[PDB]
Amino acid sequence: QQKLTSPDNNLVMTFQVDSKGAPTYELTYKNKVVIKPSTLGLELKKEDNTRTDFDWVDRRDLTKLDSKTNLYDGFEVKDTQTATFDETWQPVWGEEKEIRNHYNELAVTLYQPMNDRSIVIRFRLFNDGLGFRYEFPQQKSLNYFVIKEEHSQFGMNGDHIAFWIPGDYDTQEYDYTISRLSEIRGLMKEAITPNSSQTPFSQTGVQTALMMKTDDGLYINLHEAALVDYSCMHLNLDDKNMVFESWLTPDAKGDKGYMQTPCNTPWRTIIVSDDARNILASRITLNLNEPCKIADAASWVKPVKYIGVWWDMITGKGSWAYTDELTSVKLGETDYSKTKPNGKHSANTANVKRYIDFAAAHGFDAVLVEGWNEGWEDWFGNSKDYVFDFVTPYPDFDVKEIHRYAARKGIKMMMHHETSASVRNYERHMDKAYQFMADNGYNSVKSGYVGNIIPRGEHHYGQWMNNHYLYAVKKAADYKIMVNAHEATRPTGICRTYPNLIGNESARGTEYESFGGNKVYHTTILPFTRLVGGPMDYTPGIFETHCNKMNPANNSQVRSTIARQLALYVTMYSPLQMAADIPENYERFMDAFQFIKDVALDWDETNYLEAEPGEYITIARKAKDTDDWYVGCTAGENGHTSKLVFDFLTPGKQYIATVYADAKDADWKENPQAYTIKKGILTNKSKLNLHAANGGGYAISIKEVKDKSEAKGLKRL
């Protein structure tokens, strides 16, 4: 047996091969079993019965074709290597200024006599978790191979409580379900709600990052890191033995990965602690990704706070389309200048300029505009190939005028590249599209992949599409363009390597609050799941929570109080933050809007004050390069009472604190717009009791006093 221990001795990973040569590992935390003996390995696709060289001669051993499919047992430990790593690095943007990468490593070389080939399984043990991956060295016996299935197991020590969404190859926009592992099977049917593109794979399949809470006080998170040149990993539960196992996303032919040595699988991670706050504080995912590959990133990659012509179309008040009189359109043939405007097209110059005015007046960085280009008439569900060209504006969208105006106002326009899931079409137009952005002042783009993937047969999270998503990001970096990709595979920390990937949706966002609503506890779960691996463009900030005010036919209601929406700018971390409501609605609650105007986007420090998945999350962050702090609390269906202790503030300093909280009897459903704002003085000796209503929360801006003229007339809170 091989034993690996964490730097603090709290975690121990034991490895060995069983009597049939199957790699097996187990993990304990403070003497408590986290991962029971679980096997590791893969099954490879069998080679063609007949495969000939160019000279029409098959020189292969046809007697070993079946044996070659086995990459899961028959292994012998040939060699082992250990090492310790302890270095700190600084992210371009993040929750803290510096991240420490400290782990003890064990690399096991496994030789498989029957196939005369070897692989390496590398384990890295941190004080907050374990990460492992398979490595395939270049060798005479292993070069090109196809993965049939990966068989990485994660054996649970009990019937834990899980916070999960249905395993799916095409969408992650599902509401979370909280249940025992043994209850997943019976709840799967109702957990799978309708979506434009979805492919569930098992009655007990779930997506990662998967969050769990054990009966013996532990919090466990299962996920992956550095998903590159490989298919996305989901988890399939054996609910008899309570074992989760890797289930990769198949391509159009059912295969799960084309490999060429030397190559590695992404890392698989088990983050664990007896303190839920430590799950949020873990940086294992980022630490397992390759260091930044954009040498000059710091010079152009920057956080973005924005508003946009968007909610109009999401709610149904306005449209992305320019005209309604065409049964379909054909780019390059349809003459839009001869079509009749539907009178609902929000992406028109005059309206866009009004948004620019608002953004500039309130200190925002950019304005997003959707529906600016030809083609939106057919954007939804037609499996249309030549759906957009990403460069031709509608008759009522003056690209140059809008650029000139935005620039004069100190605002940047955020480009929108909805692809309607037509991927070859996007790649064919990508260089021209990025050049168009460069030529017209756009340095950030929100992309999208709504609908079933084209090439038809592929899924959103297969190896093929993962290659596309990264290709788009790498090409964007060459143009010094930042990317926010919706519908893409959920993040796994690749932002460390390519900091220009400032966001993804890849989970159920605020848009669904207009499609029936999101569960009240949704934002008390996302940080423990979706946010592990990268930020989310959740688009918070809805003040008029009744969608019927935007569109009479839309009776959806946002499940939140105004105060909780403010809190999300702190509890839903992201260097990309949108104030999603329309300008006129914010102008009706300008006193509350002040927090959105004040809140920072990048941080030097983050303190997770309180955290319990599905119930509440309270976070305090220190704005980068400042002595100012921002606090936010988001609560579930039962609300939450906080007894805050501001001892994290600097001793001897005075702070101007503004508390935005739920008013008495506030309620996400019956009284969402009831809030109070209190301004006073805070110090590291201050203590405050605040109550977050059901589906409520609170936000606090804490600015260091710079001139004594600020604390005039203010009292200690």
Add this chain to the structure above:
Amino acid sequence: QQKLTSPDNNLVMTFQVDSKGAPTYELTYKNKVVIKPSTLGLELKKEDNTRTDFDWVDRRDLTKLDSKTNLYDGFEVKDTQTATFDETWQPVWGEEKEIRNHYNELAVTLYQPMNDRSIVIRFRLFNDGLGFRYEFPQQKSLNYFVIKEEHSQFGMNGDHIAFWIPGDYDTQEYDYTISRLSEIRGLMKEAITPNSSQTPFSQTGVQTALMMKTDDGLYINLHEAALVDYSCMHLNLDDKNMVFESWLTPDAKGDKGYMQTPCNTPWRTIIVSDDARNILASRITLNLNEPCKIADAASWVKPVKYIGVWWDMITGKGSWAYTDELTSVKLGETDYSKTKPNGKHSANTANVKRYIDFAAAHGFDAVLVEGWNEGWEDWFGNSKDYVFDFVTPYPDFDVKEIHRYAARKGIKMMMHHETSASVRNYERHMDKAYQFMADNGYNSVKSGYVGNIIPRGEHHYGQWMNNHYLYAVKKAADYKIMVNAHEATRPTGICRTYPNLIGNESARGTEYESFGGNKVYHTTILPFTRLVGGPMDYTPGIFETHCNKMNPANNSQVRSTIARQLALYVTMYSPLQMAADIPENYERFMDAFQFIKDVALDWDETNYLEAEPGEYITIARKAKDTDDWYVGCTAGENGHTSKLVFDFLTPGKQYIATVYADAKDADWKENPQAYTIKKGILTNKSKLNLHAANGGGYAISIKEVKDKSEAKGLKRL
């Protein structure tokens, strides 16, 4: 019923809708049945049961979802329109200076009550055949649809003799089989030989252009024209009732075409005559294609006679790869400058310069070089995605020096873009690849798609790939680049619309003469099948027919005599002609090589003197802008005796004729290099008796005397 007659009254097409509302047509030639009553129509893929708009509301008639799949019956004639067209046009390059487009047309509008939608079937009847297609007007009830199967029938009046190759979605590189329609089923297994990428679909499936000969003296050719934005059509035979039916190529999900109205299917053609020579003379395929879309085509599109560093690798004498010491390579990682040359890499500067020297010395236009770029080590059968970058040369290939040297010699280098069937990879690199060509003096490119298509699941001839092949040609046109695409879907006359597509292989070429050989009668069939729709880069000109002389491990023998190889420059039409052997071998038979040096590539007139599929083809062509004629005869297994009458020559003129013929004892197998060359005078009163040996033929250059001094010493032949 409706009646449509050819301009000369010889052909009659009768159209009618039967009792169940199914469109039906029949065709007669000189009162003989060519096509028995056959139905026309298509079945569409059923729409998903639950499809919703963006508002989450299904606005469809769930009761109509089943009847909407029917686009084959329940029709009624709503309107009919007739018209006559008679115009002449001039191809940029071709077999004659002018082509006449003369037909009588009948357009039938068919309304389908149950689905409240209409389609149009347009028929065009020429003196040599019928063409028809389906048209789908844009209408409220027909916009986006997917084709399940096309059901275009071609009912035969008997058990004809057919010249066919196995129906296949991935290759056409099969030898032809000559048999009765009733014998196809029993011969299919042996007809399907091994290939790098192949997907047969039926025991009675064959490909088009399909050629047949009837017992009542007719020659019938079934094919299609203008295969654009649609899947390739093959034919499936009902060998019980002798009915051929359209069988389209499926995509990765099994579907056969994504359509969007207004749209049309390609044309389906039936070329018929009681004289086989008239099948070769038909221009129906080109006439049914859209007029030229390259405005300045005449200024840059030009025929090309070339040689190349190619046969070396095909025979195994040399290699495409630079080194043999690596199990695999990774572009951007593998440092070739540090690898050991295998000493077999033919694409090296010095060797290339020698080819350029030979090309310039003998009047050739270009030199093709394969194996010039990084990556060839892994080009075959690995289903490798990032296989080539199309721009990085190997250490021993000096791009700039070769460019300078070729330019100095008045030679152009032909670029080689083998993609190894990795299509997304080629598209991602295409603009840079074409720009590289432009920057380095390459104005023509030979592309290739060897291996199973990537995206994996697609076939070489599906709608997806057809889009790619045309995309490559259209983009090339923007760079003023000519394209010769191997492994692409066989031509259907699109060269009329895009004249820069100067070639395709898309059939069994000379390369297979090194892989065991082609059938002796192969070239007596290709003009009746493969050449209908476009020229072929057959790469004739092999003088040393024993491949073991290039590589001792290769015992393949070219099934031809030297004289027949010369004939192919006239009998295998193409504006792109290669002299495929190595310079050293041509230097052994320089007297015979003279014909290859003299023969033209473009023609003002073509006279098909003799023609019988599978037995012999004799053609005389007048070189464009000259009074010179070139003649070629290719024969099958039994040879052929020709009694030539040169009355096509101009009265009163004298011609210097050189006859390259098989020796009396010549034989493709036992005595292939035995030939005679006779030079003399020819006039329109001349008559010559020539015999083509088994697998032999002959070639004749007939140059008009410009200066009497050139005829001195010459006698009449």
